[PDB]
Design a protein around this nucleic acid. Structure first.
Lengths: 50, 282, 122, 410, 94, 125
RNA sequence: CAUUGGUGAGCAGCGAAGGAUUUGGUGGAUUACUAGCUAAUAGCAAUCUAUUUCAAAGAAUUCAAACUUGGGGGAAUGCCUUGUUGA
RNA sequence: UGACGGAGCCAGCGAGUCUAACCUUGGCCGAGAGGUCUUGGUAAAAACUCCGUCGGGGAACGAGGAAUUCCUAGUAAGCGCAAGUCAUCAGCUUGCGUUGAUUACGUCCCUGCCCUUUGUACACAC
RNA sequence: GUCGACGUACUUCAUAGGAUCAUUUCUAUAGGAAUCGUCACUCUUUGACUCUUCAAAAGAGCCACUGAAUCCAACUUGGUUGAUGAGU
């Protein structure tokens, strides 16, 4: 792992960078509920659930 | 320049790996060069083998410094920095100074707060060929590492029976001329390697008249170093010693520089092996 | 090859041509001298072309996207940028191929790693 | 390689030490030291002219050297590299000390003042940053990325307002006065700035030639169709002759070799810009040759310090009643070339020295400029040489003080 | 040449060269390029290259490099010594 | 969205991230108003990117900073570099380029290290 | 306490017989404007043919002729060049 | 060239199911080994800013003579934290950050130390 | 410190027998199985075109005139004598 961090190449671009996020402290934030839409709800669904 | 240095590291390690894969093809090409010359039959392998025989014209055209130094062995005189550990002591500052005088083309340097990656970087970027960092123990020095910079080896030596010129005798002051070198009783392949590192640390192709030789005697795993000045009398040579006397001893030989701490290890001294004490260069 | 072996013209010209082609990058190693007729291929020259280098350096995802980003104009070699997918990049220019400045692809890398600095307008 | 220019010879060729590809040159005033730097090695090599060996390899950049120059007064070597830095090396005289300057980004041309106190540096983000060398400090930059006309190529798929192929100046040069910078680049425009006021004076367009690529701003939509663009088909088949059909072109060979060893149309660019050390002109080497741009006082009405009573009729009257000093200064105030010539030849040889003594300080540079412009192509060599002897003789030391306003005139 | 043009010149150069070549005395106007004016005049060899001074073709003389020649007879004996010393060390190196 | 611009400042081992978004004119540092940046002698080192360019340019934006690393003096120099780069970068983005130029001339004529990193990279002599 | 993350319910403010995003089609510009067709010194444009044919002029390389081929070995039979037997 | 309180305020390296004392006074249980509890004795971020307070030591000592050594920028010097890596290191050694300067940056005059005294290479000059 | 002779100890080599496929009929063998001018219908396999996802990136650019869509404002009609939501 330390050798990989040494040849990181700080110009690499992969396309899923548009979905995945990070911290202010650097290491990445992964959600506990799975998908890109599986974060939070809407008002019509929440009303029906209530 | 960072991306450059890294790219040639990646390349040269690769091309060495290839080399260790084609030593066996070296050997299959030597056989045919014997058998064409003096008529001897070939083995079944080389006999049936046709890639090789089809391109044994080109390879027939085919056919010592160490490899990290081969690029600039005789062209450029080196540039060395000699530097202390961190918060030194008065005795160590003297020792560093007179080591600087021992090597021509060495510039002393005081470390306070120069973290090691910044020291390696700044030397690399300014262009200094190699770096000597020295460690004490209450005044007595005890270690010395020497490391060669465009990504090349570091030898660590431990150093033992020390006497200092400045503190023994003020009979005068050192010649500071290109010295002669003597390398005695270095035989094994590792021994050749250590000869190569110390020898290329020294200076340019010195004159025939220079009266300052420096001896490095391998006596039994312990490298011993002394400085000498002389004359030629009509019956013999009158040798007057100068400079510090200390038994050096090699105990590690990494391949990166001295920051790396995970570079590959060519040779490391192993103390707790069952037959440690029996051999030499082990 | 048809000249005789112990002949310094032959030795000089093959050693010199190997070092030429290896610096260009169309053959990888400089030891075996049979590689001239053996491992010199249109495929080796193609894989020194420009989009493939991005793909190998991981500036892309696949050679189709490296080609696409070159053609849309995000890649530069030094100061001057390349629209040209068929550019052949010698080893020492492989050091210098990079993203252009203020492209949206450069901003995405930085914004992800969380190091945009807008004074650069990166 | 060094060249003589009286007997026409290489008297030396300094070489490398491993043969790298050299990309910029800089040489001392007392021409005994030559530095060159490449895009290959990022170490400035320094050779000595006489003994053709190399004194030194001044090292310390991290990234290839893009320009070098010599301050010709104080003799310092200021160099600049894609490092994003400038380094001012002081090579002669026990020092060997060096001083770096960080610029914001990736510098790519340099220009030293005549005076030797200032370095102007043209970077990749589009400024000209003008620094002071004794200090290390930035005494002014001028922001340029806008007033630069980058066109669209036919082989482009992106608008010219985004095409950052050419939004910077790869060449720069001060005046010989210390007041203007001409800069020129990889684009269709040469821009001429003024250095104190930081505001530009004119923008020149190198060409309008739709058989070059970077030259239109907006292409034509009648051309682009379903196939693709329409100037980009091949028509070598249409040609009636074998050598006009044959199309050698090694694929993607961006700017080397002969013109049809590439299948792309030329791009307008200014390869390098300089001022003129004697006249009011400048010259810029570009795709179609060296554009030489120059000036006429004999067309523009640019008077100096006028008043109501100063007409061509009045100065002629001042001649015909012989107040030759006043007639001359009225000519210099009105600033009209025929008039100055007229009085210049009216006044007589006995009266030349008193007039030359009594001229004013403000009009001295103009009279020198006029004598130069008349002098190289006229015939009155006694008239001109009597004038010059009187002018230097009576006002030498003043010129000696103000050495730089008079660089070109003298 | 093809490989330079393909690689869009950024190569690595040749190793080296040093090869002798011959130049002729010729006037500079006869050297330059054809157009109504001219620019330079002086001859293409230098005066030192048409007559340097070297050792005298008799034996009775010693001739130095600054163009002064002296017979063997008309030197005092100490000077004959000292000139022998000078030629001794000069040809001792070369 | 919001008009928002992020810049970074840096002295020996400190760091300081400024987010500048258009708002009503507050300045805060680690969740406290700027008027309590602590070492109290160097408070005017922090106030000088404000009082070199007048308060109104900050009357119309909401600058909010976070630092870490280093000691007292280093965090002071990181805060003011980040603020100065923040104000001139926002001005290039969401107002005119001319006022970008006037800002940067002010900060550079007074003290160029409001804008560029003062990196005392070593020297082997 | 933040949110510089969504989805909504509401004000202040703006505010002339309404407003806000998205998209199809055609016209004009994108280079500096001298009109259409033909067998063309003229006719036609409602039509070129029931004068549209004549006369004159017009025939080197006696065949220069793939400047047009990825590299290495070859070629039975082809092709090609040089010789040859019988007409 | 400061003591003593409070109160604010900021680091960078360390992350192997492995990390760590010695005696003692007695009670209980067990056949013993030992087990359980009880009792006493000895070993192991700082600077900085802020607010109030204060104004010789239990016989050797009040910042260290002559001499010599070392030293040019995150340098000298202060200040703590962490590790312990096949040699060395615990009477300690190497790292890591944190505040951070005065004075030269010239000259060969002194003590030295080298060097060349053959333009040689090709202009021009000297 | 070196090569010769001898002594021992390892390492490595043959391929026979039967079949089918290779000649634009026939690979040599009679022990062998195929010569037909099309009409529908079912299931299956690859491809175009149009949209699209991971997941984005770039717009041959401007004005005019004209249609079309979606959401809010407004008005009209049905609506607590039950609107919309909602698994027999």
């Amino acid at each position: 792992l330390r050798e990989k961090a040494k040849e990181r190449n700080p110009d690499e671009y992969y396309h899923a960078m548009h979905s995945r996020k990070t911290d202010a402290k650097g290491l990445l934030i992964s959600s506990r509920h799975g998908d890109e839409e599986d974060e939070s709800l809407s008002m019509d669904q929440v009303k029906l659930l209530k | 320049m960072l991306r450059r240095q890294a790219r040639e590291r990646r390349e040269y390690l690769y091309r060495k790996a290839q080399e260790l894969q084609d030593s066996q093809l070296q050997q299959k090409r030597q056989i045919i060069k014997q058998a064409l010359a003096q008529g001897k039959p070939l083995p079944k392998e080389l006999a049936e083998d046709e890639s090789l025989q089809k391109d044994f014209r080109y390879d027939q055209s085919l056919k010592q410094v160490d490899d990290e130094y081969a690029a600039t062995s005789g062209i450029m005189d080196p540039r060395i920095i000699v530097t202390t550990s961190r918060d030194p002591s008065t005795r160590l500052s003297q020792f560093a100074k007179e080591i600087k005088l021992l090597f021509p083309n060495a510039v002393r340097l005081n470390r306070g707060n120069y973290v090691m990656p910044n020291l390696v970087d700044a030397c690399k970027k300014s262009g200094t060929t190699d770096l000597v960092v020295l460690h004490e123990h209450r005044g007595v020095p005890t270690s010395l590492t020497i490391s060669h910079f465009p990504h090349g080896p570091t030898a660590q030596f431990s150093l033992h029976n020390v006497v200092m010129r400045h503190d023994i005798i003020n009979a005068g002051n050192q010649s500071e001329v290109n010295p002669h070198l003597i390398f005695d009783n270095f035989t094994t392949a590792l021994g050749k390697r250590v000869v190569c590192i110390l020898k290329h640390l020294f200076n340019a192709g010195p004159k025939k008249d220079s009266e300052r030789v420096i001896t490095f005697a391998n006596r039994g795993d312990f490298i011993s170093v002394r400085q000498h000045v002389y004359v030629r009398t009509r019956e013999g040579v009158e040798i007057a010693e100068v400079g510090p006397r200390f038994e050096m001893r090699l105990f590690e030989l990494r391949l990166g520089t001295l920051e790396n701490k995970d570079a590959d290890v060519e040779w490391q001294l192993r103390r707790f092996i069952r037959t440690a004490n029996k051999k030499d260069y082990l | 090859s048809l000249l005789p072996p112990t002949d310094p013209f032959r030795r000089k010209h093959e050693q010199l041509l190997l070092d030429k082609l290896y610096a260009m990058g169309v053959l990888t190693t400089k030891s075996k001298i049979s590689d001239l007729e053996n491992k010199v291929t249109v495929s080796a020259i193609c894989r020194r072309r420009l989009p493939v280098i991005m793909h190998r350096l991981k500036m892309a995802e696949t050679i189709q996207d490296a080609v696409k980003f070159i053609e849309q104009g995000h890649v530069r070699v030094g100061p001057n940028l390349i629209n040209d997918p068929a550019y052949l990049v010698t080893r020492n220019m492989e050091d210098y191929v990079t993203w252009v400045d203020n492209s949206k692809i450069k901003k995405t890398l930085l914004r992800y790693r969380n190091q945009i600095d807008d004074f650069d307008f990166s | 390689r060094a060249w003589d220019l009286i007997r026409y010879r290489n008297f030396r060729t300094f070489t490398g030490t491993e043969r790298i590809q050299f990309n910029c040159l800089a040489v001392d005033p007392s021409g005994e030291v030559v530095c060159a730097g490449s895009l290959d090695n990022f170490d400035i090599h320094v050779w000595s002219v006489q003994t053709g060996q190399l004194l030194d390899a001044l090292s310390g950049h991290e990234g290839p050297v893009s320009c070098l120059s010599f301050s010709q007064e104080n003799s310092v070597l200021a160099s600049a590299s894609w490092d994003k830095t400038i380094r001012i090396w002081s090579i002669f005289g026990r020092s060997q000390q060096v001083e770096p300057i960080e610029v914001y980004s990736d510098v790519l041309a340099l220009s030293m003042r005549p005076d030797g106190k200032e370095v102007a540096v043209s970077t990749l983000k589009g400024q000209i940053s003008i620094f002071n060398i004794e200090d290390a400090k930035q005494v002014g930059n001028i922001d340029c990325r806008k007033d630069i006309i980058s066109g669209r190529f036919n082989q482009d798929r992106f608008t010219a307002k985004n095409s950052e192929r050419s939004k910077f100046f790869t060449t720069i040069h001060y005046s010989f006065d210390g007041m203007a910078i001409v800069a020129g680049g990889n684009n269709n425009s040469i821009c001429l700035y003024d250095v104190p006021n930081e505001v530009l004076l004119k923008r020149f367009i190198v060409s309008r030639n739709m058989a070059l690529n970077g030259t239109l701003e907006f292409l034509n939509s009648k051309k682009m169709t379903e196939a693709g663009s329409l100037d980009l088909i091949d028509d070598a088949g249409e040609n009636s002759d074998l050598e006009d059909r044959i199309d050698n072109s090694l694929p993607g060979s961006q700017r080397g070799g002969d013109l049809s060893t590439r299948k792309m149309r030329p791009e307008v660019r200014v390869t390098s810009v300089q001022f003129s050390p004697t006249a009011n002109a400048f010259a810029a080497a570009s795709t179609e040759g060296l554009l030489i741009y120059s000036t006429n006082d004999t067309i523009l009405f640019d008077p100096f310090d006028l008043d109501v009573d100063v007409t061509p009729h009045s100065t002629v009257e001042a001649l015909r009643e012989k107040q030759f000093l006043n007639a001359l200064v009225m000519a210099f105030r009105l600033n009209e070339e025929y008039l100055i010539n007229k009085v210049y030849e009216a006044i007589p040889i006995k009266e030349i020295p008193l007039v030359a003594s009594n001229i004013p300080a403000i009009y001295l540079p103009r009279i020198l400029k006029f004598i130069g412009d008349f002098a190289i192509e006229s015939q009155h060599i006694e008239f001109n040489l009597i004038w010059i002897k009187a002018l230097l003789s009576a006002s030498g030391g003043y010129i000696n003080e103000h050495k730089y306003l008079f660089s070109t005139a003298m | 040449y093809k490989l330079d043009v393909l690689s869009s010149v950024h190569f690595v150069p040749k190793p080296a060269s040093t090869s002798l070549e011959i130049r002729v005395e010729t006037p500079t106007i006869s050297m330059e390029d054809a157009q109504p004016l001219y620019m330079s005049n002086a001859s293409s060899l230098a005066p030192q290259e048409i007559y340097n001074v070297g050792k005298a073709e008799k034996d009775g003389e010693i001739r130095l490099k600054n163009g002064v020649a002296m017979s063997k007879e008309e030197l005092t004996r100490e000077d004959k010594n000292r000139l022998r010393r000078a030629l001794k060390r000069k040809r001792s190196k070369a | 969205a919001v008009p928002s611009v992020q810049t970074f400042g840096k002295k020996k081992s400190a760091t300081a991230v400024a987010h500048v978004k258009a708002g009503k004119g507050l300045i805060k540092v680690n969740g406290s108003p700027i008027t309590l940046v602590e070492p109290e002698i160097l408070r005017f080192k922090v106030y000088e990117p404000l009082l070199l360019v007048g308060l109104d340019k900050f009357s119309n934006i909401d600058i909010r900073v976070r630092v870490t690393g280093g000691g007292h003096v280093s965090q002071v120099y990181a805060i003011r570099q980040a603020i100065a780069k923040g104000l001139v970068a926002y001005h290039q983005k969401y107002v005119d380029e001319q006022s970008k130029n006037e800002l940067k001339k002010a900060f550079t004529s007074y003290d160029r290290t409001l804008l560029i990193a003062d990196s005392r990279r070593p020297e082997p002599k």
